[PDB]
Scaffold this active site. Structure first.
Site, short mmCIF file in Angstrom:
data_model
loop_
_atom_site.label_atom_id
_atom_site.label_comp_id
_atom_site.label_asym_id
_atom_site.label_seq_id
_atom_site.Cartn_x
_atom_site.Cartn_y
_atom_site.Cartn_z
N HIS A 214 0.63 -1.30 -0.01
CA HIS A 214 0.16 0.03 0.04
C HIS A 214 0.88 1.23 0.02
CE1 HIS A 214 -3.92 -1.84 1.60
NE2 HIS A 214 -3.78 -2.21 0.39
N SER B 124 0.25 -0.92 -6.40
CA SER B 124 0.24 -2.13 -7.16
C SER B 124 1.11 -1.92 -8.63
CB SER B 124 -0.95 -2.72 -7.24
OG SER B 124 -1.60 -2.80 -5.92
N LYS C 61 -15.14 -8.67 -7.51
CA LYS C 61 -14.27 -9.42 -8.11
C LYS C 61 -13.60 -10.12 -7.29
CE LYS C 61 -10.54 -9.15 -11.65
NZ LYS C 61 -9.40 -9.50 -10.89
N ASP C 62 -13.22 -9.99 -6.25
CA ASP C 62 -12.56 -10.81 -5.21
C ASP C 62 -13.51 -11.71 -4.48
OD1 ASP C 62 -10.05 -10.58 -5.34
OD2 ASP C 62 -9.84 -8.70 -4.09
N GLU D 12 3.69 -35.08 0.80
CA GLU D 12 2.78 -34.25 -0.25
C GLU D 12 3.46 -33.46 -1.32
OE1 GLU D 12 -0.30 -35.80 -0.64
OE2 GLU D 12 -1.12 -34.29 -2.08
C1 HEM Z 1 1.98 -15.32 2.99
C2 HEM Z 1 1.20 -15.45 1.75
C3 HEM Z 1 0.86 -14.10 1.09
C4 HEM Z 1 -0.16 -13.14 1.24
C5 HEM Z 1 -1.29 -13.51 2.18
C6 HEM Z 1 0.31 -12.41 0.21
C7 HEM Z 1 -0.81 -11.33 0.08
C8 HEM Z 1 -0.92 -10.33 -0.70
C9 HEM Z 1 -1.90 -9.50 -1.10
C10 HEM Z 1 -3.43 -9.55 -0.24
C11 HEM Z 1 -1.38 -8.68 -2.13
C12 HEM Z 1 -2.28 -7.54 -2.76
C13 HEM Z 1 -3.20 -8.46 -3.78
C14 HEM Z 1 -2.42 -8.50 -5.02
O1 HEM Z 1 -1.70 -7.51 -5.37
O2 HEM Z 1 -3.01 -9.61 -5.65
C15 HEM Z 1 -0.25 -9.18 -2.38
C16 HEM Z 1 0.54 -8.41 -3.34
C17 HEM Z 1 1.94 -8.88 -3.43
N1 HEM Z 1 2.50 -9.72 -3.05
FE1 HEM Z 1 2.05 -11.02 -1.61
N2 HEM Z 1 1.37 -12.52 -0.33
C18 HEM Z 1 1.90 -13.51 0.11
C19 HEM Z 1 3.08 -14.00 -0.34
C20 HEM Z 1 3.91 -13.43 -1.15
C21 HEM Z 1 5.00 -13.88 -1.47
C22 HEM Z 1 5.79 -15.18 -1.24
C23 HEM Z 1 5.45 -12.84 -2.24
C24 HEM Z 1 6.63 -12.88 -3.11
C25 HEM Z 1 7.91 -12.33 -2.52
C26 HEM Z 1 4.64 -11.74 -2.48
C27 HEM Z 1 4.83 -10.87 -3.21
C28 HEM Z 1 3.80 -9.84 -3.65
C29 HEM Z 1 3.82 -9.07 -4.52
C30 HEM Z 1 5.32 -8.61 -5.56
C31 HEM Z 1 2.83 -8.34 -4.72
C32 HEM Z 1 2.34 -7.04 -5.45
C33 HEM Z 1 1.89 -7.69 -6.72
C34 HEM Z 1 1.25 -6.61 -7.84
O3 HEM Z 1 0.81 -5.72 -7.20
O4 HEM Z 1 1.21 -6.93 -8.79
N3 HEM Z 1 3.49 -12.16 -1.70
N4 HEM Z 1 0.07 -9.99 -1.60
#
Ligand code: HEM
Ligand code: 3PE
Ligand code: HEC
Ligand code: HEM
Ligand code: HEM
Ligand code: FES
Lengths: 140, 238, 378, 57, 75, 48, 65, 101, 98, 108
Positions: C200, C204, C226-227, C270
């Site tokens: 935030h 994004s 959408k979500d 698994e």
């Molecule tokens: C614990 C599990 C995870 C949760 C619950 C989580 C949650 C979220 C959420 C809610 C968003 C915003 C929604 C979206 O952009 O689609 C997001 C975006 C993002 N997450 Fe995660 N995330 C997780 C794991 C990861 C991991 C492992 C990475 C890699 C290092 C990561 C990297 C990102 C990135 C780069 C974005 C921005 C994507 C964009 O704006 O296009 N996330 N994450």
């Protein structure tokens, strides 16, 4: 040549896969060499680098037909599990015709090539299966 | 060794909304009762779980007041039996795995809770191994091993029990071999999954609720997103 | 003016989930953030009910889980939902990581580090809970992977006999694993909120990679509905795997009590550890194997320093896009190879898969970005 | 269209009336869906149940 | 980064209509299926050719596993 | 700014509003009732 | 009290590639018979035709129950 | 040599994709503070044309609508206008590093 | 104070008293068939008591010295030649071999 | 300039623990908030070690607590810290509430 078509028909069809695809790419390399040899022999490409481009285009199209046709041959024979039907090669000839049309980037050439290549590939397997003699008897 | 794969057989519960044959489960419980309950254990099924699958209230009370249980303390405390109404488990024919192992030539039989679900192959495996005994083409079979190919190593320390002393289906079914094998394999399927009918009922309700609810939510998402799909830009400079 | 703009908590909810600018051309690959959130809280609630029927003892654990499956109304659906929810959790997690590596969102360093921390944490939670039901596969996989942790010399050996509570697996090991499988997901949720906070902060990333500063739309009600639709498709697939096929992902070597003498030749965990475990035993070196595994996930850490394109997407680098899909196929190859026994061709193509994995990541992607940097008159 | 218009003018002008209406519809369709689901699941088996054979014992 | 200090934009006019008056699904069987056909033809040349390589690897692996399993001496 | 005309949306609309002469009244409440009946049916499913 | 297993296992595979592999089994059986303490136990053929014959058992059994 | 290099470049520019969303070279550049500085140093009308191209491209990727044949941006009628700006950003950043060190 | 707290907490996470309490066992040897291993549980682990054949004494004599990647002679490892008694756990990763 | 004023986490830590304007008036009666927080995390820690050595079966719960207090190393100091840290937790709770009432901070 006799050697590579004999390699292609040696393998049971059947699942001894991707040797079929490599033999069909050898078919493509031979066909591309033939067409490219006559085409650069009867054009005066002006100049030689464009002739290399033309030969590469024809060999790449023929090799791509061979590769895609061998892949769909093997895959269809593995899925339908019936190594005697010609309908799998009918599907294969249509797939090869569509990819020929797409590399030539058209629609009607692709559809007519689908129809004719499918029916001729069906004739190929159908004659190899029932038994039609290659190119001669030559007896009476 | 040489690996063998059991073929899939058209079971009654093979279908995706299919039930079981509860009548077959009743006589399969009878089959487990008669002959198979000597070596194998199925301790995690109480007699009260039979009430809506294969028996009534009273018939289960007779079946469970058959066997003594050896209840715990009393005025003397040590040793006294008990009829027991329903809350008794199946009463453990070999009281220890040491005493189980010495009862045979080793190789104690596993318990029959999760045999259909936990043997890398379903009830087809169990039916095939139970019915498919045959003669060895030159193996050893060291004094306690029988030949039946649906088993890893093909060496089984179990006497083939399937047609020795067929067990008189009390509902009036002629005890052939494959019919009694089908019965006890369906009964072990039930003992492995005590929720199968109810889970497919909830699967029915869920599929109809997702035939209903999903086009509604998709329609509303497309409705509120229909503005941005059709918004149109135009470029005014001076 | 409005309490939605003055109240201190409602400042957080208002500037988080309502008045957040968004890229407007979002595909169906950004729902996975909300899906991972819903998978997380559904895992928490189903685990909470399971903990409201569980007794951690090395003799009554498997019998107690059987007691949950039988003598509890709908406890079979809650057990199955926790297991298949873990499955859908890792499915949506690898989708999220694949997107966040694909569309160039790994140009956000801080969120990437916090994410890889979450990756370790969810793997640890899922492993320990996979140990918990005292099944045969749980017992032997626990033994194997804990000795893999004992590979590191002079600091780790008695450290592993220390986390054993002795020299084995015991009641102490069972209750240690129950305590950590309980208390890791709340630290996971806190790090999820930190992850969310840094994103935030930065904003994004649209699927074109162009900074979308003229095309921002509010979060409500567009991405909300959408979500919710994406969550309803997720709930559909979760109810599919808990009402029609429990056996599509279950394990036959898990539904027996851990008789510690048999060692069944089926030994695979698994699937969400099967690609990692394949990288392990395709190298004949114990300490080298565990160092190679940890260094593979550290390669996932040291992704962004390798990035040397000039455009940030992979929609517009086609050869790099093809190498990415080869990387995806090679991960699936690792998964299937780890899901097998061990003979001659399996060993050969496992060595192939691991070395081609590191070759595609550490070498092929910057060379591709350089050659199609150079081929644009740049 | 008029049946949509008059239903809108009766129930969807308000909001509390809307919530009360969807509550009434939810309970009504809940009971009717129970009846229909029972009938369709018993129709897809018809000879394998426990109920009709246990009262035919 | 809140909403209002993003950028400086002139010369732009956005038109859009109410969500009620335009219909729910405008020509969903006459535009969407040729649209997804164009999407599929724009991607499978860059997605499909690795997965057939994996399918060949799978067939080869199972086949060579069984052939190394089977022995055939003669005496 | 006088030549600011709207590009038409005759391809996108509903036929109840698509006419260029009808009063938009009876085409309004039925349209709103259709969309809000969709929302209500969704709410019935979610409440169940 | 006569089983249907005997009936269908006799009737299904009657003259078939199963019986081809049965004759192949007899060939390796006499191959073992003309050898002292062999390695090739002639069991491989047993498994693969019983695999085939039980496929045809799988297609055509459950009407008789 | 060069007569075939142009053929390779035109093949890559067909297969790149952003010729179909009505974009150009300077529409896809990944940003640090330096490229955003190069954006800041632009003339006003070019910056207006760039933001309108960006907003059309985001709309047409929002409903996933590739432009027709009539407005696919042809190869070698596009301006490499950021080359002096970005090149002087290169030279200034290298001047800072190589002079202060 | 911090290093005392860390020390006492790591030692709290160590083990129990009776877990460290191991025991001495006596095993009867000749209850076992020829060419076959029997496992008796001791110190948590299984405990291998295996009847190796005289043919397996000769197969231990059919073991090259340095081709063992852990190169050890048989008399360096066993005490009586025909009965072998070892720890019942493969020392790589805690598996028990078949 | 500084990480502390440009980093999104240290903004929050700077506005909670460092650049928080405190009144220069508060006596030791105001100390019980931080003491409640430290007692809270100390209860979390001691209870978590208890959770690593506990078996919630009712027939063996009493024996499990016994084995904690006897044979687990330092299980007696961890259990006694947990119980009497709960006791001091409620003591600091009552002094916190009594502060917040008697010094009139309940206008909020
Ligand atoms: C614990 C599990 C995870 C949760 C619950 C989580 C949650 C979220 C959420 C809610 C968003 C915003 C929604 C979206 O952009 O689609 C997001 C975006 C993002 N997450 Fe995660 N995330 C997780 C794991 C990861 C991991 C492992 C990475 C890699 C290092 C990561 C990297 C990102 C990135 C780069 C974005 C921005 C994507 C964009 O704006 O296009 N996330 N994450
Ligand atoms: C699941 C298997 C793949 C499904 C699929 O359709 O993947 C292709 C999809 C589209 O690819 P892309 O080229 O980004 O989109 C077309 C516009 N250029 O690709 C994408 O949507 C890319 C995002 C997913 C990347 C990770 C995939 C593996 C996990
Ligand atoms: C005592 C004798 C019996 C009786 C009456 C039955 N079984 Fe069988 N069984 C027994 C033993 C000692 C063993 C173990 C042998 C070995 O380990 O090879 C078995 C084995 C089985 C299995 C094992 C298959 C597997 O392990 O994957 C099954 C499914 C099985 N027995 C079933 C079974 C059924 C259904 C019986 C009633 C007809 C039955 N057994 C009788 C000992 C005995
Ligand atoms: C803090 C909340 C959680 C609690 C209290 C909890 C509790 C439990 C319990 C008691 C079990 C054993 C039940 C069983 O397996 O039959 C279990 C199993 C498991 N848990 Fe959790 N869990 C929690 C969160 C999670 C999370 C977040 C994951 C990862 C997605 C997870 C993954 C698993 C897995 C894979 C199993 C084994 C499932 C099986 O084989 O049936 N758990 N959990
Ligand atoms: C979340 C971390 C905590 C865990 C994991 C935890 C766990 C436990 C356990 C296992 C016990 C049983 C051991 C025993 O009774 O001696 C226990 C007891 C107890 N806990 Fe906690 N606890 C936690 C936090 C707290 C907190 C914050 C309080 C309140 C200050 C608290 C108050 C108590 C009390 C009063 C007992 C009873 C002590 C006794 O009767 O012996 N616990 N806790
Ligand atoms: S060799 Fe790896 S554990 Fe036995």
């Amino acid at each position: 040549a006799k050697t590579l078509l004999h390699q292609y028909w040696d393998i049971p069809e059947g699942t001894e896969c991707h040797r079929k695809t490599y033999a069909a790419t050898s078919i493509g390399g031979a066909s591309g060499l033939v067409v490219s040899a006559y085409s650069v022999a009867l054009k005066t490409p002006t100049s030689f680098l464009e002739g290399v481009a033309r030969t590469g285009r024809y060999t790449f199209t023929a090799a791509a037909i061979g590769a895609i046709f061998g892949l769909t041959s093997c895959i269809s024979a593995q899925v339908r599990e019936k190594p005697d039907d010609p309908l799998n090669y009918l599907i294969g000839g249509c797939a090869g015709g569509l990819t020929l049309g797409a590399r030539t980037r058209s629609y009607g050439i692709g559809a007519a090539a689908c129809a004719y290549m499918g029916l001729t590939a069906a004739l190929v397997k159908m004659g190899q299966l029932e038994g039609w003699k290659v190119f001669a008897e030559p007896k009476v | 060794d040489l690996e063998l794969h059991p073929p899939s057989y058209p079971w009654s519960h093979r279908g995706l909304l299919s039930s079981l044959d509860h009548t077959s489960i009743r006589r399969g419980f009878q089959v487990y009762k008669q002959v198979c309950s000597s070596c194998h254990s199925m301790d995690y099924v109480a007699y009260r779980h039979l009430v809506g699958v294969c028996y009534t209230e009273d018939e289960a009370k007779a079946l469970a007041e058959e066997v003594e249980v050896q209840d715990g303390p009393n005025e003397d405390g040590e040793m006294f039996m008990r009829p027991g109404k329903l809350s008794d488990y199946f009463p453990k024919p070999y009281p220890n795995p040491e005493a189980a192992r010495a009862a045979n030539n080793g190789a104690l039989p596993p318990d029959l809770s999760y045999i259909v679900r936990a043997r890398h192959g379903g009830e087809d495996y169990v039916f095939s191994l139970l019915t498919g005994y045959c003669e060895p083409p030159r193996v050893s079979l060291r004094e306690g091993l029988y030949f039946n190919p649906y088993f890893p190593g093909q060496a089984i320390g179990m006497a083939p029990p399937i047609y020795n002393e067929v067990l008189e289906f009390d509902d009036g079914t002629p005890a052939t071999m494959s019919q009694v094998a089908k019965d006890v394999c369906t009964f072990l399927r039930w003992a492995a999954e005590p929720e199968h009918d109810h889970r497919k009922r909830m699967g029915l309700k869920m599929l109809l609720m997702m035939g209903l609810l999903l086009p509604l939510v998709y329609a509303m998402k497309r409705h509120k997103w229909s503005v941005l799909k059709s918004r149109k830009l135009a470029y005014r400079p001076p | 003016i409005n309490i939605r703009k003055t109240h201190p908590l409602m400042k957080i909810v208002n500037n988080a989930f309502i008045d957040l600018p968004a890229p407007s051309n979002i595909s169906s690959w950004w729902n996975f953030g909300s899906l991972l959130g819903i998978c997380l809280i559904l895992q928490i609630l189903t685990g909470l009910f399971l903990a409201m029927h569980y007794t951690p003892d090395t003799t009554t654990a498997f019998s107690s889980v059987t007691h949950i499956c039988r003598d509890v109304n709908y406890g079979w659906i809650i057990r199955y939902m926790h297991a298949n929810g873990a499955s859908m959790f890792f499915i949506c997690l690898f989708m999220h990581v694949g997107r966040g590596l694909y569309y160039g969102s790994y140009t956000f360093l801080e969120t990437w580090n916090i994410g890889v921390i979450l990756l370790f944490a969810t793997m640890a939670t899922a492993f320990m809970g996979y140990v918990l039901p005292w099944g045969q596969m749980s017992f032997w996989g626990a033994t194997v992977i804990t000795n893999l942790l004992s590979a590191i010399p002079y600091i780790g050996t008695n450290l592993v006999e220390w986390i054993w509570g002795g020299f084995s697996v015991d009641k102490a090991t069972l209750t240690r694993f129950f305590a950590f499988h309980f208390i890791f997901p709340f630290i996971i949720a806190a790090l999820a909120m930190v992850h969310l906070l840094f994103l935030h902060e930065t904003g994004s990333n649209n699927p074109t990679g162009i900074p979308s500063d003229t095309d921002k739309i509010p979060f409500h009600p567009y991405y909300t509905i959408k979500d919710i639709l994406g969550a309803i498709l997720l709930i559909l697939i979760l109810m599919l795997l808990v009402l029609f096929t429990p056996d599509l992902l279950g394990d036959p070597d898990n539904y027996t009590p851990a008789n510690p003498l048999n060692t069944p030749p089926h030994i695979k965990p698994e699937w969400y550890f099967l690609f990692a475990y394949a990288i392990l035993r395709s190298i004949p070196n114990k300490l080298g194997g565990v160092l190679a595994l940890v260094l593979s996930i550290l390669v996932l850490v040291i992704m962004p320093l390798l990035h040397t394109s000039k455009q940030r997407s992979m929609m517009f680098r086609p050869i790099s896009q093809c190498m990415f899909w080869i990387l995806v196929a090679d991960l699936l190859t690792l998964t299937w190879i780890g899901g097998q026994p061990v003979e001659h061709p399996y060993i050969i193509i496992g060595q192939l898969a691991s070395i081609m994995y590191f070759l595609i990541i550490l070498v092929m992607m910057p060379v591709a970005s350089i050659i199609e940097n150079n081929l644009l008159k740049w | 269209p008029t049946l949509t218009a008059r239903l809108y003018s009766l129930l969807f002008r308000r909001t509390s009336t809307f919530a009360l209406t969807i509550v009434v519809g939810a309970l009504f369709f809940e009971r009717a869906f129970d009846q229909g689901a029972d009938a369709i699941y018993e129709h897809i088996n018809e000879g394998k149940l426990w109920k009709h054979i246990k009262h035919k014992y | 980064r809140q909403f209002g200090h993003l950028t400086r934009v002139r010369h732009v006019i956005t038109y859009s209509l109410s969500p009620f008056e335009q219909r729910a699904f405008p020509h969903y069987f006459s535009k969407g299926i040729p649209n997804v056909l164009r999407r599929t033809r724009a991607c499978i040349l860059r997605v499909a050719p690795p997965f057939v390589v994996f399918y060949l690897v799978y067939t080869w692996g199972t086949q060579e596993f069984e052939k190394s399993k089977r022995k055939n001496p003669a005496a | 700014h006088t030549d600011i005309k709207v590009p038409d949306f005759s391809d996108y609309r509903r036929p109840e509003v698509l006419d260029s002469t009808k009063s938009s009244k009876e085409s309004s409440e039925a349209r709103k009732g259709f969309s809000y009946l969709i929302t209500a049916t969704t709410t019935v499913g979610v409440a169940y | 009290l006569v089983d249907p297993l005997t009936t269908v296992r006799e009737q299904c595979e009657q003259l078939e590639k199963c019986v081809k592999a049965r004759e192949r089994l007899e060939l390796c059986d006499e191959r073992v018979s003309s050898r002292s303490q062999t390695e090739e136990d002639c069991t491989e053929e047993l498994f693969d035709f019983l695999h085939a014959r039980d496929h045809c058992v799988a297609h055509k059994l459950f009407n008789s129950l | 040599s060069s007569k075939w290099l142009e053929g390779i470049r035109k093949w890559y520019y067909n297969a790149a994709g952003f010729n179909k969303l009505g974009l150009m070279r300077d529409d896809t550049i990944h940003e640090n503070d330096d490229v955003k500085e190069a954006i800041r140093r632009l003339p006003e009308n070019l910056y207006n044309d760039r933001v309108f191209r960006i907003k059309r491209a985001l709309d047409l990727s929002m409903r996933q609508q590739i432009l027709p044949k009539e407005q696919w941006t042809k190869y070698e009628e596009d301006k490499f206008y950021l080359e002096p700006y970005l090149k002087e950003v290169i030279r200034e950043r290298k001047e800072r590093e190589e002079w202060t060190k | 104070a911090a290093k005392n707290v860390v020390s006492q907490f790591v030692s709290s996470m160590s083990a129990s008293a009776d877990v460290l309490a191991m025991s001495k066992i006596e095993i009867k040897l000749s209850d076992i068939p020829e060419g076959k291993n029997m496992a008796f549980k001791w110190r948590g682990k299984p405990l291998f008591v295996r009847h190796r054949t005289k043919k397996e004494i000769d197969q231990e004599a059919a073991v090259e010295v340095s081709q063992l990647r852990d190169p050890q002679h048989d008399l360096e490892r066993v005490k009586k030649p025909e009965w072998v008694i070892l720890i019942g756990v493969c020392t790589h990763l805690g598996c028990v071999p078949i």
